Amino acid sequence: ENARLSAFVGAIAVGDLVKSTLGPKGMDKLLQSASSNTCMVTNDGATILKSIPLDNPAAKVLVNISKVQDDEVGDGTTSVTVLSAELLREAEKLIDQSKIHPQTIIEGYRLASAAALDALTKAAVDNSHDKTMFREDLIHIAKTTLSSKILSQDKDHFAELATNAILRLKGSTNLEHIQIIKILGGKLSDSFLDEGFILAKKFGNNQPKRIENAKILIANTTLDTDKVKIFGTKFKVDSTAKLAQLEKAEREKMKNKIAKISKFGINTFINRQLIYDYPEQLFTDLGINSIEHADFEGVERLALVTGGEVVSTFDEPSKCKLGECDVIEEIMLGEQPFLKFSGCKAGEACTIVLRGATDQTLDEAERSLHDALSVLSQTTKETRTVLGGGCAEMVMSKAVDTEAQNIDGKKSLAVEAFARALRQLPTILADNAGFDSSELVSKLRSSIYNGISTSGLDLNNGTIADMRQLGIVESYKLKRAVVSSASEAAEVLLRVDNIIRARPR
Amino acid sequence: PQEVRKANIIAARSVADAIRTSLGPKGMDKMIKTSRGEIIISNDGHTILKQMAILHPVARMLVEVSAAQDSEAGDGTTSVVILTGALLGAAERLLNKGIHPTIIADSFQSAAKRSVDILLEMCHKVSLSDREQLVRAASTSLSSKIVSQYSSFLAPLAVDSVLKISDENSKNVDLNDIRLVKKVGGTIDDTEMIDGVVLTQTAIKSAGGPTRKEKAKIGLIQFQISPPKPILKEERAYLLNICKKIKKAKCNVLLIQKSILRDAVNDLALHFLSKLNIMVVKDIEREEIEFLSKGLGCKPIADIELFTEDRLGSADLVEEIDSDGSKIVRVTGIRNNNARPTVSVVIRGANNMIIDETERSLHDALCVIRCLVKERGLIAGGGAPEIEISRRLSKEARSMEGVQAFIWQEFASALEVIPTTLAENAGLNSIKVVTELRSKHENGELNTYEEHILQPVLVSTSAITLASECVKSILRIDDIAFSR
Amino acid sequence: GLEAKKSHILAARSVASIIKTSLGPRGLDKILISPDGEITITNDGATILSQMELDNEIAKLLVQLSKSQDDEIGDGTTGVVVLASALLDQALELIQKGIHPIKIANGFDEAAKLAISKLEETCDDISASNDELFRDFLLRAAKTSLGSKIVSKDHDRFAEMAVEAVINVMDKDRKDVDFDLIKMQGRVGGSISDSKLINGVILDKDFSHPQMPKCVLPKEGSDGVKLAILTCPFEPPKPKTKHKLDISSVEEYQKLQTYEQDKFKEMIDDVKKAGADVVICQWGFDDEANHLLLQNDLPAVRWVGGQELEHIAISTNGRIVPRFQDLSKDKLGTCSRIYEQEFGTTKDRMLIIEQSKETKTVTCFVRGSNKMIVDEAERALHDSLCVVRNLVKDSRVVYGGGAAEVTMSLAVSEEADKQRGIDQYAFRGFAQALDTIPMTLAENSGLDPIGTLSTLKSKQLKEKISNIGVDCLGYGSNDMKELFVVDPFIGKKQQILLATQLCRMILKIDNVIISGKD
């Protein structure tokens, strides 16, 4: 039990050190040394935790976790430790009243964290308004990155393709939504923009070049040339022809899995390996298309834009997550076969085709493009804020109460306690600012409980006021960064049942 | 709360393990030295637990269980303590697994009811109409006593006495109606049933007493014949009206309760009662006051005005049998249709140690016969019923579900403690003998029959029932507080 | 003879009780602190038991046994120790009853042999069901161990790396995989998506002087790419006595100049006849030493450890040339090519040496953004490679995860009544000891161990005989056979044999003798 107490009582005692320092009106702390003449005073939470020597082996783990927030972003480092300490206060009450492995309680935090992120999205605002001023700055910054790069030949043509490849995304900025197709024997000025998912090495011979209402399924199997290495296995046969009969009997059992493919209502099947002529010929009568050379990367990028999933096995027929594309066009350019996928439901993606004169110009253009798009796409999550002043903090609290309706018997207290920790943020801010936490939070939750609540925490008048009129907002990137860091920080301490005392120095 | 229960279980387990060594005639006897200097030696579990002066509150419950064990079944006072401690020893690991005692307590009561039907199916069905098994039951039970050749003579005496009062649906029969009067002198060969009644004392040995009367009435009278106690003719005048009111109801038998306060009968009243031939028996114990009010159907009479004829019984012949150092008075033909005739047998012998152990030996013989009255049939002892139950519970434990499924596995393991102790007390290897009994279980079942060793079914049935509620009530108390 | 038998049970139980909570995918981790100041957290019991330094003579058998379990199986770390503690707890009750300890040891051996024959009837065939179902087991083999980590998102990439690696190093004749033929190497930095499957040794090299090309020329259609390794201390003329070499003045500039370089001109002709493209040595090189070999397109490699030279000669079929005079081209190794491929943003600029032919060894390539992620991925891949070996060596497999222990329990307990004598109770205690694993998995899953164990026994008797285990991680429903979750039979068979072997060595020692410390 002391293993958890050292990670709870020991962490809360250390966590309460920087807890009162949250906010500009928070408390302060002095750091005293042995000689006492080297001391200093500061409000930094990360400095106080790292400077104070602690023989507690559980406290040293929290120090390494806080370093991730500084390197990734570097904002709100103190808020991560304060929120992580409040999660331990509720988790300690769940354990002592249970004495069951916390890993089950950890599963309740993952389901509750999903509802908190969805509640912040609907109420989120942005500074993206008047895109006409932001679009003119986006093309100018991209031309600066093109310096020293071979792409500097024509800045207007290359920056225009990157402009329509960002604002038209309307979604995640990850590079997995941008396909890079590069060919040889072409000019850089001939590059064009395409919204389709483009392959090479066209599939099939007698297969048609036009497919309407195509479905996408991901699977891994080898239907051609099984038994890769036959050396070393004892072969006892009366005739030589019986050797090939064993390979046909193994592929004969695949007919049940092939029959389940037609039951899925799909006209196209994707496989990484090849397919023998007999199972491929049956695909024509059943209307099944066989796509080859899907590799791995292109498989993951296709399932995300089409809303599909990837699996190497069949768990049960008529259960899966499938994508679709309306029109598939097969053309040929640059003396190489190409493929084109279009008509995807809610498809959001783009493809930039760069034509180089050699292999050296292709690798330098692809690496320089990712560095230029990463800086431009960084402003999407930057400057975007949400309504602050305890409002959004309470919105995450009432969103967990929705999950508290349908819940398991033993998972209810795990989810319900997560909402109590979210309400500890206005309690700490009210105590550090010199106000009554019990009076403000009580009136704050009753108003935000059902509907039409713009109210928030007002520290000037010492009461609950509307934050939209005062103009109090906080960044949305800071919201997700602290919640995701505090959720992973609490898992590290709970997943450790026994903590061995560290070697004293 | 476990600190209160675990401390009581360990304290009760040490007591049960100590009494466990006393099981059987070859068991280890326990010595208890009282503060007054008295030292007793015996293997009886009811005597050890009574004189031990146990200060543990839960451990004192074994005295009440051992008291009801001898009052109902009449045997197994040591075995019921062993079975109680066996369930407490197996319950130590149950609390470590997080099992609530309610499931532990409810499973013991459900298993005790199912264990009865298992024993009845394996038991042999017998009837009380056959005297072959009834005589051999009491004869073999006396092989543990000094009497040997005289045991066969007292066997039909105990059989004919129970069958008359057993009837059919009477079920439990009160044992207080059976009183064995022991007196120095005589021998065992001389026995008289005397179904009417038997007193505990002799009659008046003074001069003038008839000591014998025919067609007399017997009744309880709490009065006493004494001179005035807030001159010769004054005391005789006060005693004349006393004997005159008794003559009004024609009561020739006067039973005066023994009291150290005053005397019983004055010498002047002996000459008055000699003319009317009124027999008087004094020194009536206080315990016999309730006994005489049952079989005789009379009522205790406190004063002289309360004395009436309707409260007097009927006695065909009242005489004093002439015997060496005995002088026992017998009554025959009480003629009571409503009340059943009482059974009182006089025990005679030369040595004082004879009539003592003989009275205790006949008590255990009447209980075993009485076990067949409530439930007919018998199961041979020696670990046969304890192992047979565990054989059926092996496949039945797999048919359960939940926490109770594991209790059936530990319940059969606790039953093996009784046959294991019997093998240890005999010097034989514990496990080696038990394995030989389970090996032949595939063919033989109850087979001890050729050794003339028999045990009633009520002893094995009551031992499980009493131990089930005992342990059940132990886990009910989670705290001990001082209340005065 | 008195307190020894009682103390050995309590001492081995307290040590085994440490890893009982870490068994299974839901088993909780632990914080281990190395004496150098590094904190390590892992769910593998082999790391926890290896770091234990203790003077207790009973717990020393767990460390010596766990060393051989990693090479043979690797999954018998936590499972065997917990199972061995169950046999000791059941044996403690028999000591108080007068049972001889050797009879307890011999009773577990006869009970284990009878339980193996029971699973032989109920086992299922893999290759007889289908050929591609076997490969699906290899893809999901590493998914179970990595499902509790962030790696579980990219697990589909690491699944295809172990399929081709085992086939090359293992032949279907002996069906054995050597630990020395698998090179496990990892570094800090990068991501886990850049991990590639290499058919040969990595041998990271910066190609010395930058003027050397990043690719090896075919040398006019020559066969493969030939390499030359030299472990000789290639070095100046150091005699055995004098030394003492110094330049007096400028007058000695041309005197000692032409007297030296004329030597190596004889030995360089023998190297060109063999066609060795690259020279590899154990220690470093001078600055001007590689300049004359640059005009001939002959790169050189320096700073190579002694252990790294094992995977270079086996994969590329090369050797180490004793002398250049008699060196021929017959035994010189030939590979596909040697090129340099940058990995992520790391400035080390590693390289890739391919083969295109089946070799006798492979090299595992694992990367990660954290030092802990790399170490956790290397140990999880080791156990995944051993499961593939067990599936090829034994086609018949059974369903584990709590289903195998319940089946072995009902088989021994049913046959216990048919076998009389002292072994009758030895079979009952052995059957109750096997119930510890499914109850431990039930406790580690946050469920009633007794309530769950009674359910698994009821479904395998009144309904039909099948394999239904306890789920430590949340799944859709029971009956893992529908989810195609398989465990190697010979892997589980090796665990129950080492468990009985460990339990005997504990009971066979009745005395503890140790000296003092001075």
PDB file of C-alpha atoms in Angstrom, chain C residues 168-352:
ATOM      1  CA  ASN C 168      15.698 -17.598 -43.237  1.00  0.00           C
ATOM      2  CA  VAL C 169      17.419 -18.387 -39.928  1.00  0.00           C
ATOM      3  CA  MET C 170      15.486 -21.619 -39.243  1.00  0.00           C
ATOM      4  CA  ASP C 171      15.418 -24.757 -41.386  1.00  0.00           C
ATOM      5  CA  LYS C 172      12.439 -27.117 -41.428  1.00  0.00           C
ATOM      6  CA  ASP C 173      14.742 -30.042 -40.555  1.00  0.00           C
ATOM      7  CA  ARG C 174      15.799 -29.201 -36.996  1.00  0.00           C
ATOM      8  CA  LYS C 175      13.249 -26.356 -36.645  1.00  0.00           C
ATOM      9  CA  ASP C 176      15.472 -24.440 -34.221  1.00  0.00           C
ATOM     10  CA  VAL C 177      16.411 -20.760 -33.986  1.00  0.00           C
ATOM     11  CA  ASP C 178      19.766 -19.635 -32.592  1.00  0.00           C
ATOM     12  CA  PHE C 179      20.001 -16.544 -30.401  1.00  0.00           C
ATOM     13  CA  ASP C 180      23.464 -15.687 -31.750  1.00  0.00           C
ATOM     14  CA  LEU C 181      22.053 -15.545 -35.301  1.00  0.00           C
ATOM     15  CA  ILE C 182      19.660 -12.699 -34.370  1.00  0.00           C
ATOM     16  CA  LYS C 183      21.254  -9.255 -34.034  1.00  0.00           C
ATOM     17  CA  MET C 184      19.158  -6.921 -31.867  1.00  0.00           C
ATOM     18  CA  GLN C 185      20.237  -3.296 -32.304  1.00  0.00           C
ATOM     19  CA  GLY C 186      18.465  -0.042 -31.508  1.00  0.00           C
ATOM     20  CA  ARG C 187      19.185   3.630 -30.943  1.00  0.00           C
ATOM     21  CA  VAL C 188      17.491   6.685 -29.449  1.00  0.00           C
ATOM     22  CA  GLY C 189      15.709   9.093 -31.772  1.00  0.00           C
ATOM     23  CA  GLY C 190      13.433   8.837 -34.773  1.00  0.00           C
ATOM     24  CA  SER C 191      10.097   7.048 -34.852  1.00  0.00           C
ATOM     25  CA  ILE C 192       8.800   3.477 -35.010  1.00  0.00           C
ATOM     26  CA  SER C 193       7.448   3.820 -38.569  1.00  0.00           C
ATOM     27  CA  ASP C 194      10.953   3.873 -40.101  1.00  0.00           C
ATOM     28  CA  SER C 195      11.800   0.345 -38.920  1.00  0.00           C
ATOM     29  CA  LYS C 196      12.729  -1.864 -41.877  1.00  0.00           C
ATOM     30  CA  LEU C 197      13.416  -5.589 -42.188  1.00  0.00           C
ATOM     31  CA  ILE C 198      17.037  -6.140 -43.252  1.00  0.00           C
ATOM     32  CA  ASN C 199      18.307  -9.505 -44.493  1.00  0.00           C
ATOM     33  CA  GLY C 200      21.866  -8.823 -43.307  1.00  0.00           C
ATOM     34  CA  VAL C 201      24.072  -6.965 -40.859  1.00  0.00           C
ATOM     35  CA  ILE C 202      23.577  -3.206 -40.518  1.00  0.00           C
ATOM     36  CA  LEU C 203      27.192  -2.128 -39.863  1.00  0.00           C
ATOM     37  CA  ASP C 204      26.718   1.613 -39.496  1.00  0.00           C
ATOM     38  CA  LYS C 205      29.577   3.488 -41.158  1.00  0.00           C
ATOM     39  CA  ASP C 206      30.214   7.084 -42.229  1.00  0.00           C
ATOM     40  CA  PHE C 207      32.392   5.976 -45.198  1.00  0.00           C
ATOM     41  CA  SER C 208      35.364   7.831 -43.663  1.00  0.00           C
ATOM     42  CA  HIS C 209      36.376  10.612 -46.045  1.00  0.00           C
ATOM     43  CA  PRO C 210      33.275  12.172 -47.666  1.00  0.00           C
ATOM     44  CA  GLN C 211      34.662  11.877 -51.212  1.00  0.00           C
ATOM     45  CA  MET C 212      33.966   8.130 -51.180  1.00  0.00           C
ATOM     46  CA  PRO C 213      30.674   7.363 -52.967  1.00  0.00           C
ATOM     47  CA  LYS C 214      27.615   6.154 -51.090  1.00  0.00           C
ATOM     48  CA  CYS C 215      27.203   3.143 -53.414  1.00  0.00           C
ATOM     49  CA  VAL C 216      29.471   0.269 -54.447  1.00  0.00           C
ATOM     50  CA  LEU C 217      30.240  -0.081 -58.142  1.00  0.00           C
ATOM     51  CA  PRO C 218      29.640  -3.487 -59.779  1.00  0.00           C
ATOM     52  CA  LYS C 219      33.243  -3.416 -61.117  1.00  0.00           C
ATOM     53  CA  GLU C 220      32.550  -4.420 -64.723  1.00  0.00           C
ATOM     54  CA  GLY C 221      29.779  -6.943 -64.145  1.00  0.00           C
ATOM     55  CA  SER C 222      31.608  -8.652 -61.288  1.00  0.00           C
ATOM     56  CA  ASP C 223      29.745 -11.171 -59.146  1.00  0.00           C
ATOM     57  CA  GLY C 224      28.201  -9.552 -56.065  1.00  0.00           C
ATOM     58  CA  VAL C 225      30.152  -7.283 -53.730  1.00  0.00           C
ATOM     59  CA  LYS C 226      33.229  -8.726 -52.024  1.00  0.00           C
ATOM     60  CA  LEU C 227      34.424  -7.540 -48.614  1.00  0.00           C
ATOM     61  CA  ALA C 228      37.662  -8.038 -46.683  1.00  0.00           C
ATOM     62  CA  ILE C 229      37.855  -8.036 -42.879  1.00  0.00           C
ATOM     63  CA  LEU C 230      41.209  -7.783 -41.093  1.00  0.00           C
ATOM     64  CA  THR C 231      41.592  -8.295 -37.344  1.00  0.00           C
ATOM     65  CA  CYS C 232      45.362  -7.829 -37.610  1.00  0.00           C
ATOM     66  CA  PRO C 233      46.830  -4.752 -35.872  1.00  0.00           C
ATOM     67  CA  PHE C 234      47.622  -2.941 -39.112  1.00  0.00           C
ATOM     68  CA  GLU C 235      50.077  -0.349 -37.833  1.00  0.00           C
ATOM     69  CA  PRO C 236      53.604   1.187 -38.138  1.00  0.00           C
ATOM     70  CA  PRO C 237      56.863  -0.813 -37.911  1.00  0.00           C
ATOM     71  CA  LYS C 238      56.996  -1.288 -34.146  1.00  0.00           C
ATOM     72  CA  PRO C 239      59.906  -3.643 -33.322  1.00  0.00           C
ATOM     73  CA  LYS C 240      60.228  -5.763 -30.180  1.00  0.00           C
ATOM     74  CA  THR C 241      63.181  -3.840 -28.712  1.00  0.00           C
ATOM     75  CA  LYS C 242      64.414  -0.471 -29.949  1.00  0.00           C
ATOM     76  CA  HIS C 243      61.708   1.806 -31.433  1.00  0.00           C
ATOM     77  CA  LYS C 244      63.109   5.372 -30.945  1.00  0.00           C
ATOM     78  CA  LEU C 245      62.315   6.936 -34.315  1.00  0.00           C
ATOM     79  CA  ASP C 246      62.848  10.676 -34.737  1.00  0.00           C
ATOM     80  CA  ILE C 247      63.430  13.147 -37.565  1.00  0.00           C
ATOM     81  CA  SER C 248      66.720  14.973 -37.033  1.00  0.00           C
ATOM     82  CA  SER C 249      66.371  17.742 -39.633  1.00  0.00           C
ATOM     83  CA  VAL C 250      65.194  18.494 -43.172  1.00  0.00           C
ATOM     84  CA  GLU C 251      68.112  16.450 -44.556  1.00  0.00           C
ATOM     85  CA  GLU C 252      66.198  13.291 -43.568  1.00  0.00           C
ATOM     86  CA  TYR C 253      63.063  14.309 -45.505  1.00  0.00           C
ATOM     87  CA  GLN C 254      63.951  12.438 -48.707  1.00  0.00           C
ATOM     88  CA  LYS C 255      66.036   9.727 -47.006  1.00  0.00           C
ATOM     89  CA  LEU C 256      63.198   8.096 -45.040  1.00  0.00           C
ATOM     90  CA  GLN C 257      60.484   8.951 -47.596  1.00  0.00           C
ATOM     91  CA  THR C 258      61.095   6.580 -50.518  1.00  0.00           C
ATOM     92  CA  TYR C 259      62.310   3.855 -48.124  1.00  0.00           C
ATOM     93  CA  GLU C 260      58.814   3.341 -46.647  1.00  0.00           C
ATOM     94  CA  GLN C 261      56.030   3.687 -49.242  1.00  0.00           C
ATOM     95  CA  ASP C 262      57.737   1.152 -51.546  1.00  0.00           C
ATOM     96  CA  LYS C 263      56.628  -1.643 -49.178  1.00  0.00           C
ATOM     97  CA  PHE C 264      52.818  -1.535 -49.428  1.00  0.00           C
ATOM     98  CA  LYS C 265      53.066  -1.346 -53.237  1.00  0.00           C
ATOM     99  CA  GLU C 266      53.702  -5.110 -53.248  1.00  0.00           C
ATOM    100  CA  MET C 267      50.732  -6.060 -51.050  1.00  0.00           C
ATOM    101  CA  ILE C 268      48.206  -3.858 -52.875  1.00  0.00           C
ATOM    102  CA  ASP C 269      48.520  -5.988 -56.022  1.00  0.00           C
ATOM    103  CA  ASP C 270      47.242  -9.092 -54.214  1.00  0.00           C
ATOM    104  CA  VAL C 271      44.106  -7.257 -53.057  1.00  0.00           C
ATOM    105  CA  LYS C 272      43.126  -6.191 -56.580  1.00  0.00           C
ATOM    106  CA  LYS C 273      43.425  -9.788 -57.810  1.00  0.00           C
ATOM    107  CA  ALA C 274      40.823 -11.005 -55.307  1.00  0.00           C
ATOM    108  CA  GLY C 275      38.476  -8.081 -55.940  1.00  0.00           C
ATOM    109  CA  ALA C 276      37.739  -7.046 -52.354  1.00  0.00           C
ATOM    110  CA  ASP C 277      35.746  -3.813 -52.501  1.00  0.00           C
ATOM    111  CA  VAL C 278      35.886  -2.712 -48.846  1.00  0.00           C
ATOM    112  CA  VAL C 279      38.393  -3.270 -46.033  1.00  0.00           C
ATOM    113  CA  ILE C 280      37.139  -3.664 -42.452  1.00  0.00           C
ATOM    114  CA  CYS C 281      39.343  -3.494 -39.350  1.00  0.00           C
ATOM    115  CA  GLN C 282      38.787  -3.507 -35.597  1.00  0.00           C
ATOM    116  CA  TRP C 283      40.516  -0.189 -34.805  1.00  0.00           C
ATOM    117  CA  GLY C 284      40.769   3.231 -36.409  1.00  0.00           C
ATOM    118  CA  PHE C 285      42.654   4.471 -39.455  1.00  0.00           C
ATOM    119  CA  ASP C 286      44.896   7.423 -40.233  1.00  0.00           C
ATOM    120  CA  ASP C 287      43.815  10.430 -42.307  1.00  0.00           C
ATOM    121  CA  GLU C 288      46.070   9.825 -45.328  1.00  0.00           C
ATOM    122  CA  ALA C 289      45.648   6.034 -45.223  1.00  0.00           C
ATOM    123  CA  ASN C 290      42.367   5.973 -47.183  1.00  0.00           C
ATOM    124  CA  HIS C 291      43.359   8.522 -49.844  1.00  0.00           C
ATOM    125  CA  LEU C 292      45.283   6.179 -52.154  1.00  0.00           C
ATOM    126  CA  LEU C 293      42.449   3.635 -51.949  1.00  0.00           C
ATOM    127  CA  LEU C 294      40.044   6.393 -53.042  1.00  0.00           C
ATOM    128  CA  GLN C 295      41.334   6.526 -56.627  1.00  0.00           C
ATOM    129  CA  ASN C 296      40.747   2.763 -56.913  1.00  0.00           C
ATOM    130  CA  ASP C 297      37.205   3.076 -55.464  1.00  0.00           C
ATOM    131  CA  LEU C 298      38.090   0.923 -52.435  1.00  0.00           C
ATOM    132  CA  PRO C 299      36.425   2.282 -49.277  1.00  0.00           C
ATOM    133  CA  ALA C 300      37.604   1.345 -45.797  1.00  0.00           C
ATOM    134  CA  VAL C 301      35.749   0.752 -42.528  1.00  0.00           C
ATOM    135  CA  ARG C 302      37.126   1.398 -39.035  1.00  0.00           C
ATOM    136  CA  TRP C 303      35.838   1.249 -35.445  1.00  0.00           C
ATOM    137  CA  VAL C 304      34.076  -2.117 -35.538  1.00  0.00           C
ATOM    138  CA  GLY C 305      33.574  -4.242 -32.442  1.00  0.00           C
ATOM    139  CA  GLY C 306      34.472  -7.896 -32.177  1.00  0.00           C
ATOM    140  CA  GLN C 307      30.879  -9.083 -31.817  1.00  0.00           C
ATOM    141  CA  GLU C 308      29.727  -7.130 -34.885  1.00  0.00           C
ATOM    142  CA  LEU C 309      32.089  -9.156 -37.101  1.00  0.00           C
ATOM    143  CA  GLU C 310      29.990 -12.294 -36.530  1.00  0.00           C
ATOM    144  CA  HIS C 311      26.917 -11.075 -38.430  1.00  0.00           C
ATOM    145  CA  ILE C 312      29.054  -9.653 -41.256  1.00  0.00           C
ATOM    146  CA  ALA C 313      30.680 -12.954 -42.244  1.00  0.00           C
ATOM    147  CA  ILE C 314      27.547 -15.100 -41.894  1.00  0.00           C
ATOM    148  CA  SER C 315      25.113 -12.876 -43.800  1.00  0.00           C
ATOM    149  CA  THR C 316      27.431 -11.751 -46.612  1.00  0.00           C
ATOM    150  CA  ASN C 317      29.196 -15.164 -46.741  1.00  0.00           C
ATOM    151  CA  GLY C 318      32.527 -13.378 -46.259  1.00  0.00           C
ATOM    152  CA  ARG C 319      35.593 -14.391 -44.273  1.00  0.00           C
ATOM    153  CA  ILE C 320      38.711 -12.851 -42.710  1.00  0.00           C
ATOM    154  CA  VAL C 321      41.759 -13.156 -44.974  1.00  0.00           C
ATOM    155  CA  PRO C 322      44.827 -14.515 -43.121  1.00  0.00           C
ATOM    156  CA  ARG C 323      47.240 -13.717 -45.954  1.00  0.00           C
ATOM    157  CA  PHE C 324      46.870 -11.979 -49.314  1.00  0.00           C
ATOM    158  CA  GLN C 325      49.284 -14.278 -51.179  1.00  0.00           C
ATOM    159  CA  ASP C 326      47.122 -17.416 -51.383  1.00  0.00           C
ATOM    160  CA  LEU C 327      43.771 -15.593 -51.229  1.00  0.00           C
ATOM    161  CA  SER C 328      41.431 -16.707 -54.019  1.00  0.00           C
ATOM    162  CA  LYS C 329      37.989 -15.655 -55.259  1.00  0.00           C
ATOM    163  CA  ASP C 330      36.225 -18.949 -54.479  1.00  0.00           C
ATOM    164  CA  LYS C 331      35.274 -18.382 -50.830  1.00  0.00           C
ATOM    165  CA  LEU C 332      34.885 -14.594 -51.052  1.00  0.00           C
ATOM    166  CA  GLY C 333      31.373 -13.521 -50.143  1.00  0.00           C
ATOM    167  CA  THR C 334      29.024 -11.837 -52.606  1.00  0.00           C
ATOM    168  CA  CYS C 335      26.039  -9.669 -51.649  1.00  0.00           C
ATOM    169  CA  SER C 336      23.590  -7.528 -53.609  1.00  0.00           C
ATOM    170  CA  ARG C 337      25.117  -4.092 -52.898  1.00  0.00           C
ATOM    171  CA  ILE C 338      26.078  -1.697 -50.102  1.00  0.00           C
ATOM    172  CA  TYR C 339      24.431   1.731 -49.982  1.00  0.00           C
ATOM    173  CA  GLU C 340      23.851   4.513 -47.457  1.00  0.00           C
ATOM    174  CA  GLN C 341      20.279   5.385 -46.458  1.00  0.00           C
ATOM    175  CA  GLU C 342      19.599   8.225 -44.032  1.00  0.00           C
ATOM    176  CA  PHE C 343      17.170   7.340 -41.232  1.00  0.00           C
ATOM    177  CA  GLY C 344      14.866  10.187 -40.216  1.00  0.00           C
ATOM    178  CA  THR C 345      16.448  13.439 -39.075  1.00  0.00           C
ATOM    179  CA  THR C 346      19.329  11.701 -37.272  1.00  0.00           C
ATOM    180  CA  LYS C 347      22.709  13.069 -38.366  1.00  0.00           C
ATOM    181  CA  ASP C 348      24.450   9.702 -37.897  1.00  0.00           C
ATOM    182  CA  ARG C 349      23.520   8.789 -41.506  1.00  0.00           C
ATOM    183  CA  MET C 350      23.295   5.022 -41.192  1.00  0.00           C
ATOM    184  CA  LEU C 351      23.479   2.577 -44.101  1.00  0.00           C
ATOM    185  CA  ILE C 352      21.765  -0.575 -45.366  1.00  0.00           C
TER     186      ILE C 352
END
